[PDB]
Every structure is written in C-alpha cells, then in structure tokens.
Design a protein around this ligand. Structure first.
Ligand SMILES: Nc1ncnc2c1ncn2[C@@H]1O[C@H](CO)[C@@H](O)[C@H]1O
Ligand SMILES: [Zn+2]
Ligand SMILES: [Zn+2]
Lengths: 255, 49, 315, 55
C-alpha cells in the first residue's frame, strides 16, 4: 500500500493541512489553481515542456497534502517546484533564469533585482531551500505519470479526429489546473474522464471495439461508465465554481 | 493545448512557449491563445492581485 | 515543519569515510539497533548555484527503477535536523581496492566470474534504457559473498533508440577519462550502450595488469594512448569517423597498428580472454561487441568454468 | 550438462528479466442529460474546436 500514499480519500482532502489552519475548502482549492496557473505561466516563459509544467503541478498538489498554504505560500513554492521539475523532466533551467521569470510574473512593477544585491542572493537561498523542502516532503518520489500519456495513446487507438485529440488533451491539462484528481484517481482513470467529457461536448461518439469492449476498457480495467459519468459531473461542477462562472466574456470584435 | 506524442523522450518534448506573445485583448482568439490565457482570461483565475 | 517520508540519518552510526562520490562524501555506517551496514552518500550542496544536483536526481530516479542482483541497491534517502544522504546496501569490497591489494590473488576462474557478473549487470541496465557512463574499477563493488554490484549511478542517464530521425545530443564529456571511449573524445553526443562496454574492456584488462591500461592526462593524450594501443583511427577501420568535426582538428597519428593482444599477451595469457578484450576495445562502437554477444563468448563457457569468489575474498 | 545447453539456458535467464475501433461518428440524438448539461455550460463545441490546439 505504497500507491495509496499519494492518493487520498475525500475525508483526507477535507482534512487538509490547510484546513487544519482554518482555510476554507473552496479557498484552498483556489490557492491550488492559482499555483497551477503560476506554474503554467512561468513554464511558458522559460519555454519548458508541458510535461515539465504538469510534473511541477503534481508536485504542488502533493506538497499541500503534507504542508499548509498558511506556512508555505503558493507563489514561493511554485518557482521551486518548477525549477525541480525542469531537472527531473530533462529540460533543466538555470536558477538565475527561474528567479527572473518568477519576478516578472509576481512583480511586473518592480525592477529585476541586481544579481549582486543582498536581496537577490536572498531570493536564491529561499528557492534552493524550498526545493530541498519539496524534495523531502515528497519523500524523493519524483517520477510522475500524467493523464496526457494515456489520453494521447487512447485517441490514436480509437482513431479520433485532430479536434477530438486536441480537446481530450486540453481537458487533461485543465484537470490538473482546476481539480485535485491527481490526488484522487490514477492517470489512466483521469484520461478516460477527459476523453469522455470531450466526447459528450463534441457529440463525437466512440463505438465498441471489434471484440465487443468499450474504449475505456483498453485504458484501465477498473473504469466503468457509472464512474465516468459521475466524475465528468464533478469536473463540470468544479468548472462552474471558477470565477467568471463559465460565462462567455469575449467581445466578438477585432483586436 | 496542443497534444504531444508521449512516446517522445522527456528531453525531446517541445517547449510550451507560444509562438506569439500574450496580449490583453479579450477576443475569442486571444482568450484561447494558450493555457495561461484560457485559465486567466476565460476562467478568471489569477495568482496576482 | 512536518516531513513524514524522510527519516533522519541519525538511525545510522557513521563508522568511517570510504571515498568521494560523483557529488558527495561516502561513509560506511551501521544501523544503531539492528547493526545492518549501509553506505551513506552525502549530497554536498556546496553547489547551491543550481540547487539540488540534477546528477543526484538522476541517480535517485534510476535506482528506484533498476532492481538487479548486479546493480547496487538504494534503500532510502535520509536528512539531517539540512544535508541529504543517499542510503545504499553496503558492500565489503570495491574492485579497484582488490586489484591494488597485493594479498588478493585471482584465479582465471574467478576473473571469468567477475566479468560475467559485470556484463550481466551492464546487460540489464542497457535493456532498461540506462547508460552508466562511468565504468571503472572503483565503481564496481563486491559483497562479502562475492556478488558484484555496479555502483555510483551519479553519472548515469536514460537514453533513446530515437527514431530513425532527429538524433540525441547527450552530454559529451562523461566517463572518467581513462575509461572514456574514442567516440566521446571525438565529440560524439549521439552515443549509446557501447561506451560502457569500452570501459568493461578497460576493466577486464586491469584484472591481469592490476593497473589501468591507458592513463591519459588530457583528452588528446588519452586519444593518443588509445591510438598507440588500439591502432590508428581511420575511416578504413572506422567508417564515417571523417564526419566528426574534430577528426582533423586534433591531428591523429596515422602509422600505429593494433597492438591490443601484443601488449596484453604477456599479462593475460589466456587466449579466449585476449580475444574478448580485443572485441571490447574495438574503436568503432558500431563494431564493438555488445553485452549479449560478450556473455555468450567462449571465454565464459570453456574450461575452467567460472567459480564463486567467496573463496579468494577471505584473504 | 553440455556447455551449449548450459550456455543457452543462461542466455534465456538473462532475457526473462526484461484496427480495433471504427472511425468515430457524430450523434445528434438521442441526447443524454450529461451532454445537454456540458453544451449549456461550455457552449457550442464546433465554435471552439478551431481555437483549442493548432491549425
Ligand atoms: N558500499 C560501498 N562499499 C565500499 N566502497 C564504496 C561503497 N559505496 C561507494 N564506495 C566507494 O565510493 C567511491 C565511489 O563513490 C569508490 O571509492 C567506492 O569504492
Ligand atoms: Zn485579439
Ligand atoms: Zn497566451
């Protein structure tokens, strides 16, 4: 039962280290989403793989099943996690570069601190420390499996169109950003939920195989239609609770 | 946003940086410019104040 | 500051220093309550320039994956109330030490067994898409019961069979210089398992010479020593070696004939042994023997058959 | 007992340590509650599909 270490029940998620310090469920979930968004932004500026960002996000999710947002702000943890993930996923970025990108994101007003300043070397010390804390908190379990792997593999099998492949993959990223599925269900299960959701939206339908089995049976042997509907439900529920509550805020105008 | 063949080795994966810089326009195209834009513009999630 | 999945290293008692690793100091220690021996490899975060070393991260990742009788075993990772310690299963001996020890004498049978276990280990890690990238006598451990263990994966990494297309650009300056193969010295960055087997050849020669066979001081010096011993590096013996940007930029001696068997003849004596070393120190990695072919070589299945080390080690 | 056999037995010990679907189609009806919900919330898929991903 070493798997169930980084997988939790709803009772455990409800009793988070942050709940322990008086942080509302919706507010903690918000803090996670912001960290994910910050990780994604920084990652895109650093130009690392999405894999790196995704790994960094799972670290963050797991970090806060042990530590509290009270004690460790997301905006301090996030650059450390990404810096670590960058190495693990074989696209390492210079520590100088990360602190730069992090500064740009969190302080667009301030000027980029001097590389010699006492204040800059303090930023370095904090990042390197947090990395060490993240590593120890995770028990040096740094190998992460993502839904994207199984999503892409599955869409090839079922001969999906580019849009359906794109959308399924897109929902996989959204699952990491907006939910705590990475802490509840294994990547193959989440992959199905994403594909299932993309299908219900697009009205694409995946038939049964030549051997009479549903597509998700080729992804995970524990998944059932009952589970998929129920999780797609929960996924949508999380989507509504986002700010802008899904309303279409664009303008139908030029630029 | 864009799928990546998982069979690629980690050091082979393309970078996540979009070809074009993120704007402040809120048109449909710009709200789905990239993952960051979608999460921040379309869904209203931000880490900054 | 909670930390449930990282025990304190206090549970172990350091007994002595036992060498310098890829990124740390290494200590022999015994568990305070059970007496179980371990090797603590301390991650030296002196280099806070890039935080936790990616070099150490790879070792931890890789050894959590690899599990084999001839690969060293990672037990856990410990902290101090801070510095990090990698905790390995302890091995009484290392091959370099044994070869330097004058009281240690190998029978031919025992050498066969050492090389057999070594190549078995290399065979395993290679099929799991891992390069060791630091094959040398000092990184080969042997337990009290005479079981060989490949160790110090600080320099190891995963590699690809990619993809009839865009080739890899791995790190070039790897492997201890003395055991570094020709292609790396010529700047190859799309290499593979053969680089480890070059080292296996170098180590196999040491089993009889009791001293590293090519001790260069620079990459050019090492290349020169290789040329003298293995013959001149030429397209005739190594197709498309021309294509290396540095092939002419370095100026390589052209006269040298191959003298591998000639020079090792007096020390090794065994015919099959000489042949296997000859196939391991082939210049062109495409023509260099591989783990599987090596392990089926007559050297391992002719008399005297390999025997257990346990005997020789107690002296 | 022979070397060839003892050799092969070891070669193997070494070694032992190491269209299903039709093309998906559109479905106008019947509609289920899940789909109906999703479409009401995310909107019309075809209006969005060319914005999610690359062209
Ligand atoms: N378990 C061990 N037993 C003996 N020496 C070791 C052990 N681990 C590492 N070393 C030594 O550490 C150095 C390389 O890390 C070599 O000198 C090697 O012999
Ligand atoms: Zn616009
Ligand atoms: Zn953008």
């Amino acid at each position: 039962n070493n798997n169930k270490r980084w997988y939790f029940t709803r009772e455990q998620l409800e009793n988070s280290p942050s709940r322990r310090f008086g942080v509302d469920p919706d507010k903690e979930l918000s803090y996670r989403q912001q960290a994910a968004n910050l990780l994604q932004d920084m990652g895109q500026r650093l130009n690392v793989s999405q894999l790196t960002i995704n790994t960094a996000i799972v670290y963050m999710h797991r970090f806060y099943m042990i530590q509290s947002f009270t004690q460790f702000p997301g905006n301090s943890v996030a650059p450390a996690a990404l810096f670590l993930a960058a190495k693990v996923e074989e696209q390492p970025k210079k520590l100088e570069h990360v602190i730069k990108v992090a500064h740009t994101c969190l302080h667009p007003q301030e000027s980029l601190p001097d590389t010699r300043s006492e204040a800059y070397l303090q930023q370095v010390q904090d990042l390197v420390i947090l990395e060490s804390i993240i590593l120890q908190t995770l028990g040096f379990e740094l190998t992460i499996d993502h839904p994207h792997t199984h999503v892409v593999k599955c869409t090839q099998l079922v001969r999906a169109s580019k849009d359906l492949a794109q959308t399924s993959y897109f929902m996989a990223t959204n699952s990491l950003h907006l939910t705590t599925f990475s802490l509840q269900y294994t990547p193959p299960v989440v992959a199905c939920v994403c594909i299932h959701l993309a299908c219900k939206w697009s009205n694409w339908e995946i038939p049964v195989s030549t051997d009479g089995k549903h597509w998700w049976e080729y992804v995970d042997a524990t998944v059932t239609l009952e589970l998929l509907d129920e999780l797609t439900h929960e996924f949508l529920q999380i989507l509504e609770k986002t700010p802008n509550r899904l309303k279409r805020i664009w303008n139908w105008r030029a630029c | 946003m864009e799928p990546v063949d998982p069979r690629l080795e980690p050091w082979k994966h393309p970078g996540s940086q979009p070809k074009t810089a993120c704007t402040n326009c809120y048109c449909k195209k710009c709200c789905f410019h990239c993952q960051v834009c979608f999460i921040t513009k379309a869904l209203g999630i931000s880490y900054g104040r | 500051v909670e930390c449930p999945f990282c025990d304190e290293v206090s549970k172990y008692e350091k007994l002595a220093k036992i060498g310098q690793g890829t990124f740390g100091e290494v200590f022999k220690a015994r568990h305070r309550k059970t007496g179980q021996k371990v090797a603590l490899k301390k991650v030296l975060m002196e280099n806070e320039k890039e935080g936790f070393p990616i070099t150490a991260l790879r070792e931890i990742k890789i050894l959590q994956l690899l599990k084999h009788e001839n690969v060293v075993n990672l037990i856990e990772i410990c902290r101090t109330k801070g510095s990090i310690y990698l905790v390995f299963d302890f091995c009484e001996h290392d091959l370099a030490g044994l070869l330097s020890n004058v009281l240690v004498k190998f029978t031919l049978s025992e050498i066969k067994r050492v090389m057999q276990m070594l190549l078995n280990g290399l065979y395993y890690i290679h099929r799991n898409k891992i390069l060791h990238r630091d094959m040398k006598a000092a990184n080969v451990l042997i337990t009290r019961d005479g079981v060989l263990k490949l160790a110090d994966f600080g320099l190891a990494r995963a590699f690809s069979l990619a993809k009839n297309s865009q080739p890899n650009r791995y790190t070039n300056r790897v492997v201890t210089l003395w055991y570094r193969p020709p292609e790396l010295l010529l700047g190859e960055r799309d290499y593979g398992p053969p680089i480890d087997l070059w080292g296996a050849g170098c180590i196999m020669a040491e089993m009889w010479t009791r001293s590293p066979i090519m001790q260069g001081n620079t990459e050019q010096h090492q290349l020169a020593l290789i040329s003298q011993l293995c013959g001149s590096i030429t397209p005739e013996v190594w197709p498309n070696v021309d294509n290396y940007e540095l092939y002419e930029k370095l100026e390589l001696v052209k006269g040298q004939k191959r003298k591998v068997k000639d020079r090792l003849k007096a020390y090794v004596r065994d015919p099959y042994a000489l042949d296997l070393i000859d196939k391991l120190l082939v210049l062109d990695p495409a023509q260099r023997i591989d783990s599987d072919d090596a392990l089926n070589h007559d050297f391992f299945w002719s008399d005297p058959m390999p025997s257990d080390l346990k005997g020789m080690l107690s002296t | 007992e022979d070397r060839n056999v003892l050799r092969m037995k070891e070669r193997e010990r070494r070694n032992q340590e190491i269209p299903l679907f039709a093309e998906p189609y559109k479905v106008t009806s019947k509609e289920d509650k899940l789909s109906s919900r999703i479409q009401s919330m995310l909107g019309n898929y075809d209006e969005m599909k060319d914005f999610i991903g690359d062209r």
